[PDB]
């Protein structure tokens, strides 16, 4: 399935270094980031 209006992770990451996120959004981002860690770790992605 196709998903709309996403960007390269590090496009935003670089921007968040420059202009940080409000903390509530940042917490949200981390919640999501953790789900990526779990996924990549279990399947042991060789290419992330």
């Amino acid at each position: 399935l196709f998903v709309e209006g996403y960007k390269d992770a590090d496009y935003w990451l670089r921007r968040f270094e420059a202009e940080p996120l409000p903390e509530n959004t940042n917490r949200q981002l981390l919640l999501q980031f953790e789900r990526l860690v779990v996924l990549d770790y279990i399947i042991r992605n060789t290419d992330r």
Binding site: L13, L31, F33, E34, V37, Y41, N45, T46, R48
Partner: protein, 48 residues
């Protein structure tokens, strides 16, 4: 070699944050349950 296929997100500052309670609650009941893990291998086998 352990250097060969890194998880690139491990270098991000976000990767330094202890896991939240949210992820412990979503994941631990599942992956610490031998039945769940066995269902998973089953589902995967079925696909592979």
């Amino acid at each position: 070699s352990w250097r060969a296929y890194p998880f690139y997100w491990a270098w991000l500052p976000q990767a330094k944050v202890p896991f939240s309670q949210e992820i412990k609650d979503l994941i631990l009941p599942k992956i610490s349950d031998p039945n769940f893990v066995k269902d998973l291998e089953e589902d995967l086998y079925e696909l592979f």
